[PDB]
Design a protein around this ligand. Structure first.
Ligand SMILES: Cc1ccc(-n2nc(C(C)(C)C)cc2NC(=O)Nc2ccc(OCCN3CCOCC3)c3ccccc23)cc1
Length: 282
């Protein structure tokens, strides 16, 4: 047999998105692609929409993988799928708009890194989400501050905009599957905490040519000024930034670590997003 133009479970090809969704503007960009802000026709709910110019039905089948993953990952600390449409020769993906901004953009505008209680909340929530991702046998593979988006309410939304300062050593060294692929996120998480503490990641100052080398041959990175930080934090990094994927701890194991195991309030991150919000206009 052979199938032509299959009907995908979370996609509607029988309806224009412009019936439901009003294009309000361009949400900036990098080298990611073409993303747009949009308003709901019935409710006025804000959302972000990306559009891809798919030539063939073989291409379309590739790009919908992102939709299948987004749909199956319904969790309080992960971007949330609202819908997908395939109209004309354009695939539309939409998720709930995030008005806090990426954690790195927050750091840029304040010209300062996060405080420790700020880092603790991000860490605990990132951990809750990774534990869920690994629950579904899904690996992120590109964790960094730029993929941590913020709401005004105080909670993160984990994203992925699909140079390698956050790459795990076993992945740097690889020349070719393995039972400890999920662990690579845990290295990247650790590098993300240092990025959040010091604005930039380790080895930021080097020729990018040298970065894979440096990561392969160096001892795990540590905080530039340990005295400024808690013992719980330094210890957390030490066991998270383990070069052996086999002895590196799971997301679940770290949740029990005293650096995050008593964090219940999201307050410090509510307070953070507000400062950033207040300095947008002045
Ligand atoms: C191949 C592939 C497969 C899966 C993914 N993938 N995996 C995840 C998990 C792991 C977190 C569940 C998430 C994603 N994808 C994303 O999070 N992708 C996106 C990033 C940034 C965006 O917009 C910019 C930000 N914008 C403005 C602020 O408010 C939020 C929206 C997006 C706008 C609309 C639709 C998707 C967007 C990625 C790639």
């Amino acid at each position: 047999s052979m199938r032509k133009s299959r009907e995908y479970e979370h996609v509607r090809r029988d309806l224009d998105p412009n019936e439901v969704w009003e294009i309000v503007g361009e949400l900036g960009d990098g080298a990611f692609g073409k993303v747009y802000k949009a308003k709901n026709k019935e409710t006025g709910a804000l959302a972000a929409a990306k559009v891809i110019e798919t030539k063939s039905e073989e291409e379309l089948e590739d790009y919908i993988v992102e939709i299948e993953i987004l749909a199956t990952c319904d969790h309080p600390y992960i971007v949330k799928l609202l819908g997908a449409y395939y109209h004309d020769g354009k695939l539309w993906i939409m998720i709930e708009f995030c008005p806090g901004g990426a954690v790195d953009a927050i750091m840029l505008e304040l010209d300062r890194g996060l405080t420790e209680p700020q880092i603790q909340v991000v860490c605990r929530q990132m951990l809750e989400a990774l534990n869920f991702l690994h629950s579904k046998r899904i690996i992120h593979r590109d964790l960094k501050a730029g993929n941590v988006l913020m709401t005004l309410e105080g909670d993160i939304r984990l994203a992925d905009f699909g140079t390698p300062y956050w790459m795990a050593p076993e992945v740097v060294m690889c020349e070719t599957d393995t039972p400890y692929d999920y662990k690579a996120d845990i290295w990247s998480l650790g590098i993300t905490l240092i990025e959040m503490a010091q604005i930039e990641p380790p080895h930021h100052e080097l020729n990018p040519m040298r970065v894979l080398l440096k990561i392969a041959k160096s001892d795990p990175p540590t905080l530039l000024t340990p005295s400024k930080w808690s013992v719980e934090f330094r210890d957390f990094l030490a066991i998270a930034l383990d070069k052996n994927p086999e002895t590196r701890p799971s997301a679940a194991q770290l949740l029990e670590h005293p650096f995050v195991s008593s964090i219940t309030s999201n307050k410090a991150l509510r307070e953070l997003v507000a400062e950033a919000k207040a300095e947008v206009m002045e």
